[PDB]
Paper text:
Muramidases are N-acetylmuramide glycanhydrolases which cleave the β-1,4-glycosidic bond between N-acetylmuramic acid (NAM) and N-acetylglucosamine (NAG) in the carbohydrate backbone of the bacterial cell-wall peptidoglycan. Here, the identification, characterization and X-ray structure of a novel fungal GH24 muramidase from Trichophaea saccata is first described, in which an [name]-like cell-wall-binding domain (CWBD) was identified by structure comparison in addition to its catalytic domain. A ‘domain-walking’ approach, searching for other sequences with a domain of unknown function appended to the CWBD, was then used to identify a group of fungal muramidases that also contain homologous [name]-like cell-wall-binding modules, the catalytic domains of which define a new GH family. The properties of some representative members of this family are described as well as X-ray structures of the independent catalytic and [name]-like domains of the Kionochaeta sp., Thermothielavioides terrestris and [name] enzymes.
Attempts were made to crystallize the full-length enzymes from T. terrestris and [name]. The crystals of the T. terrestris enzyme contained only the catalytic [name] domain, which was closely similar to that from Kionochaeta sp. The [name] crystal, in contrast, only contained the [name]-like CWBD, which was similar in fold to the GH24 CWBD. Again, the aim was to crystallize the full-length enzyme, but as for the T. terrestris protein the domains were cleaved during the crystallization process. In contrast to T. terrestris, for this protein the crystals contained only the N-terminal CWBD. Its structure is similar to the CWBD from the T. saccata GH24 muramidase. There are two independent monomers in the asymmetric unit with a zinc ion bound between them; this zinc ion is a crystallization artefact. Two disulfide bridges are present in the same location as in TsCWBD, which could add to the domain stability; however, they are not likely to be essential because the structurally similar [name] domains lack these disulfide bridges. The second disulfide bridge could, however, play a role in target specificity because it brings the C-terminal loop into close proximity to the binding pocket. In addition, two ethylene glycol molecules are bound to each monomer.
Numbering used by the authors: 1 to 74
The structure:
Amino acid sequence: YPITGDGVNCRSGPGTSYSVVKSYQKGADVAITCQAPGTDVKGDNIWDKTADGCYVADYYIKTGSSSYVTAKCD
Ligand SMILES: [Zn+2]
């Protein structure tokens, strides 16, 4: 799914307390392997684990939902 934020952090866990691993530019498109609850970002507290293995706040990914579109991370 595509990134909608203008430079979005990808963190080592589902929340803003976790270290930043890398970033994506707006219009990057990422594969989401699973989703996990975490810090609320503007009403969406889901975090999306990408194929890079780090988590992007779902607020900044265009999935057409503020809830789950994939399996919950185990
Ligand atoms: Zn995609």
